[PDB]
């Protein structure tokens, strides 16, 4: 089964030179398969692209959630994921997803991707249940904390500022302030 190999080649090419650039021929060349092999797995370029988006979302979700267990205290689960996000900066996953349609597909993709972040939801739900977090939708809590520090990571990896360990922990703490009740 060459599906992952093809997705890996595809993702590399998209990271490199984007969605619209993708050639089925170079894909086959880079994946090391005949063109015909690609069509045994994907009906056409457009279906391949959707599978790429879903596959990138799945990898991000497992990277973000790596090392988390729901036994940890809330703040430690938060810190772990926050730091996993920081360490994704400069990766292919970030590169690809910073681009990502109609809205039959657009909403399909969005909905399928949300299901993949089950431990992020459990953190925010548990926090709200415990009276620790502000009572906002998990999408808002995510936007105020995790999703925003993608921005810090991005701007750090691109050189806009250097952050020492004291400074990083200060950033983690400040973002926690955004989501906790005061």
Which residues lie across from 133 on neighbouring strands? 180
Please name the residue ranges forming H helices in the chain: 3-17, 24-31, 35-38, 45-64, 74-88, 92-97, 103-115, 118-129, 138-144, 146-157, 165-179
Task: Kindly state whether residue 161 participates in binding its own copies, applying the rule CB under 8 A.
Answer: yes
Structure tokens at 147: 């999703």
Task: Kindly state whether residue 41 participates in binding its own copies, applying the rule CB under 8 A.
Answer: no
- For residues 84, 89, 90, 95, the Cα torsion angle rounded to the nearest 10 degrees is 100
Rounded to whole angstroms, how far apart are CA atoms 80 and 97?
Answer: 21
Binding-site member from 106, 121, 131, 132 for its own copies (CB under 8 A): 106
Binding-site member from 18, 44, 130, 132 for its own copies (CB under 8 A): 18
- Residue burial 90-102, b: 16+ Cβ < 10 Å; e: rest: eebbbbbbeebee
72-91 mask for its own copies (x: CB under 8 A)? --------------------
Q: How far is the CB of 161 from its own copies (least distance, A)?
A: 5
Nearer to its own copies, 20 or 43 (CB): 20
3-state secondary structure at position 106: helix
Q: How far is the CB of 171 from its own copies (least distance, A)?
A: 5
**Could you say which residues in the range 140-159 bind its own copies, by CB under 8 A?**
140, 142-145, 147-152, 155, 158-159
Binding-site member from 21, 53, 93, 96 for its own copies (CB under 8 A): 21
Q: How far is the CB of 111 from its own copies (least distance, A)?
A: 9
Rounded to whole angstroms, how far apart are CA atoms 89 and 91?
Answer: 6
Task: Kindly state whether residue 116 participates in binding its own copies, applying the rule CB under 8 A.
Answer: no
Nearer to its own copies, 33 or 172 (CB): 172
The alpha-carbon radius of gyration of the chain (Å, integer) is: 19
Q: Where on the chain is the footprint of its own copies (CB under 8 A)?
A: 17-18, 20-21, 99, 103, 106-107, 110, 134, 136-137, 139-140, 142-145, 147-152, 155, 158-161, 163, 167, 170-171, 174-175, 177-180, 182
């Amino acid at each position: 089964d060459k599906r992952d190999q093809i997705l890996a080649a595809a993702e590399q090419l998209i990271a490199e030179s984007g969605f619209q650039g993708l050639s089925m021929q170079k894909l086959a060349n880079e994946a090391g398969v005949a063109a015909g092999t690609i069509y045994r797995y994907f009906s056409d370029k457009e279906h391949l692209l959707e599978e790429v988006r879903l596959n990138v979302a799945k990898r991000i979700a497992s990277a973000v959630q790596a090392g988390v267990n729901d036994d940890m205290p809330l703040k430690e689960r938060y810190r772990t994921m926050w730091l996993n996000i920081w360490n994704l900066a400069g990766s292919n996953l970030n590169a690809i997803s910073n681009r990502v349609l109609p809205c039959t597909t657009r909403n399909k993709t969005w909905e399928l991707e949300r299901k993949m972040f089950a431990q992020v939801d459990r953190l925010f739900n548990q926090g709200k249940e415990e009276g620790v977090f502000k009572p906002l939708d998990n999408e808002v809590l995510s936007g105020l904390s995790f999703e925003a520090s993608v921005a810090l990571a991005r701007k750090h990896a691109l050189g806009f500022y250097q952050l020492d360990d004291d400074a990083l922990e200060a950033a983690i703490e400040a973002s926690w302030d955004a989501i906790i009740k005061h």
